[PDB]
A and B are shown apart, each in its own frame.
Chain A
Amino acid sequence: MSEKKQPVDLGLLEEDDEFEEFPAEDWAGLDEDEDAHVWEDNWDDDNVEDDFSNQLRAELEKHGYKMETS
């Protein structure tokens, strides 16, 4: 029928009317570093990236101190 897509596109118009080009530019701050890059790898790199965003992001500089303590 393809006629039920109209209210869904109206919901997309409401989501686009919530923030006017705010997620396109704010998310484009990372998309400019993510553009043309394979998005299949961005799920693993974003998985470990967001996983380590809270604490122990790099953790490679700390191993030099953890060698003698552990």
Chain B
Amino acid sequence: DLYSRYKKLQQELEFLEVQEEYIKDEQKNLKKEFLHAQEEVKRIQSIPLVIGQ
């Protein structure tokens, strides 16, 4: 238990280390989707329209 915490903890080192490139992928992809949906809802607003009050 005393000495096993090192090598047992290394599995948590790998499990937490593997999340770096993952959160890189999410933060680099979800903003591309943010500008995709942003331009998609932006292009809905068209110039030809009716004027009310």
The answer to A–B direct touch (Cβ < 8 A) is no
Chain B residues packing against A (C-beta within 8 Å) = none
Chain A residues packing against B (C-beta within 8 Å) = none
